[model samples]
Target chain A: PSDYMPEVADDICSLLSSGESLLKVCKRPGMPDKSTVFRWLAKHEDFRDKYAKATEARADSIFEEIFEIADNAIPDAAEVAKARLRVDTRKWALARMNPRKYGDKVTNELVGKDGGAIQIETS
Target chain B: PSDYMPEVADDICSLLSSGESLLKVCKRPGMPDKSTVFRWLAKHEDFRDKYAKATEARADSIFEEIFEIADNAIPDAAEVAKARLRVDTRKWALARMNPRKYGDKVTNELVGKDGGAIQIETSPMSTLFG
Candidate 1:
């Protein structure tokens, strides 16, 4: 059974800030895997907040990579596809981590002619 | 067999620009059906260009609706879903009409460390756009 260790959490944060993907961090020898980490997140609100911030940092790291790829001169078709995959994967991760800001669903309201309100949604 | 008529093309463009879906326009009575319109598009490069512009205009109209829905108050789940469907459909249509600008596939050149260039593709872009 995995138990919460503050030191382990700190190391996870460090790895995340240093551009390590959650999966990679989880697979590190002697470290908790994703399921354990996710369990900890669910059981501990404080830990959840910290994990959320780490995900944001991870997203930032991925964003930097995207810009670096963009800065290079015209890329060939393969390079372009690779870049798209990189971006799309990171975007998908970010959206899942913080759906309120990045989720595909968009919500809006419609005002009726009689000044009434109607809600609409799409995903 | 449907033949290309400039007047009929004009009517199709009018409907498309007015925010009618391609299917809806094709099904209108006394108007050329979708198969006819699509055949004309494949046969006549000139008509294809015209159809592309009309689809863009249609996409623009749908975009306006999205914003209008946004400007009001927060919508419920159903309404939000409806709005999303609307935007998504138009976006899909626009991407098909003018893939270079709107398509999902992004093309780029990657110079290897040895300065050699490599070409890659995603989404079968060559098959669709070629």
Candidate 2:
């Protein structure tokens, strides 16, 4: 039911939007080779645009995966605390992929009374 | 507004600098209620920094305690094995908390190591500025 047509590119983009890396997508039965995909990408602006759209979607999918990790229970705290690695990677990756959407901390900067900071006498 | 006072800050800073958590200090009877300490630190000017600086040393303190235990020769087989793996894990607690040493911040609440360090709120004033 598939071949390396423009339609196949569209379907691959859809798969990418869900979480499939292009490497994973291109290897499957009836799918195109990665070389073929990039070759097509060289000329087709529309296909490139679809792929970009999927990039952000893939970012969201990676982010929600962090929740999946934290919510599942059974491991001890300190041991399961390897949890940080998976969660940490996703945050930076998400930030890098679609920085305008996910990057930068959002904490409302709290000001001190009358803009008076908590002073320190280091001398 | 200065009801809980700076003398309290000075004494608490001294105690906390020596690796005491607020919970244990209140038990000693000289320290004020836990809430008083929390609000005082929240409202005060200079005390916040000294208190947090002590908190870092405390983080360093307990992290070192794990190594001390690891170096000890245990009498029984049970606790030795028990602590070996647990010590492997216990350091992770500080790894996230002591981001000052880590050279980058790992937001404890964002990682949501929830109910782990948070429930003992009175202990760590470091999280306030960090």
Candidate 3:
């Protein structure tokens, strides 16, 4: 009961680490007031950016997919291991369904590197 | 070195970006499978959009302070900082302590700026970057 402060702070940090907002994180388990959590982050320099970056990076790769295949193929492939791959499969579905549409927007923008890069020659 | 197909494709795309999951990227730390990875991506896209919007635009401001006081002021502060800006900072605290008390819904509808199109809204890319 008494160690609630650290416990809540750690949980809040986890939420924030996942790129969720501080206020949104407050809604997570072991919640603390906005001020208490912010203060904790301010005081604990090491936990602040390090944890956030690590989790966001984890999320970035969590759904690595194949592009250019028929949208239906995504589900079929992912179905092989639905339990571990559902979230990522959904992204593939979204990309195929939402197939970037345009071929020459930000040729350099960092979307999935391969799935379907629609590059057009600009002569 | 033997499995060059997955290795090269993943590497090429990783160079383009971090979230590489296609034939792969310019490169990644791991020389894993690309189609195997895309199959992974496709299989994974079901990630679905739940955890919802969770937060909206501009709840971003919560400075917690009284700038005029000159009483030490905010950190790295050009001003002062106060504390606990809320009601029932208590019951809410307790409720929020439980995960169920917090559920989020995310929606992104555009607003503000008045009846004019001169100012320009933030780009969708900005939303991605945001």
Candidate 4:
């Protein structure tokens, strides 16, 4: 049985942060099994939080890539159409993966009148 | 002085869930002042949670409206042009405000198998916006 090591969790999250699928990461030599990864997800606090943050990071990473693709696209009709399909796929995938963050709506976090609370603390 | 009232929270949340901004909601005749609202948010943790959820719900509400606007557009060129701006503005706003839900990437929540978690539990997020 594989023991829960924090480093293993870190490795897995690192891959996920860069857009690699967990399944693929698990298949790599010396990596833990899927069951083990899921166990960490269920049993560990930090790992779960890390996984969620890694996912958001992955979304952000792709978010940047899409902008570059748009910026660098040539004005050819067929090329533009191809880029559009790729953009659409990524956009749809991003939204589903992190709906609360990327969903099609405006959700502002209330800070204070000027992003500073009147609590007079935590500065 | 205005006191903290659950009904007031409900009224604020109700308007917010339907896409009204807090500033606008606060300006209503019976509503509390902006500073009072801010104080309430600071003092009551529950109100803070309510505020966040209502904000997310507002996103959901706007999401549905976008689809409705797209579906109900007329065939006139000028009308389509107007519809495009509304759609674009809403999309940009939605993406910025709730980037996690509406951001551009794919994230999969792992389950034990077939989404039945190894330890048991939860759900999916498909075309769940409606």
Supply the TM-score of chain A against the true chain A for every candidate structure. Answer: 0.66, 0.65, 0.32, 0.58
- State the lDDT of candidate 1 residue by residue for A58-111, as single tens digits: 654453343334333133445545544555575566567655444554222334
Per residue, candidate 1 scores C-alpha lDDT tens digits across B1-130 of 2889988998898888776665566667878765566557657888888877887787666556556644652365444444443344445444434444555653233343344322343453556555
Give TM per candidate: 0.38, 0.38, 0.23, 0.37
List residue ranges in candidate 3 displaced over 4 A: A1-8, A43-123, B1-130
For candidate 4, lDDT tens digit of each residue in A11-65? 8899989877555787899998665665566568888898888878888887787
The TM-score, computed over Cα atoms with residue i paired to residue i, of candidate 2 is 0.38
CAPRI-style class, candidate 3: incorrect
Best by lDDT: 4
Model 3 Cα lDDT, one tens digit per residue, B1-130: 2233443443443342322223333234555443333323333322111111111100111112122223443353111111111111212222222223322223333332452222443434635554
Winner on DockQ between 1 and 4 is 4
Model 4 / residue B62 / CA error / Å: 1.7
Native A-B contact fraction in model 4: 0.05
**lDDT of every predicted structure (CA atoms):** 0.60, 0.60, 0.34, 0.67
Q: Count the backbone clashes (under 3 Å) in each candidate.
A: 19, 0, 42, 19
Better structure of 1 and 4 per TM-score: 1
Error of 2 at B36 (Å): 50
Please give the distance, in angstroms, between residue A106's alpha carbon in candidate 3 and its true position after superposition: 20
DockQ of 3: 0.02
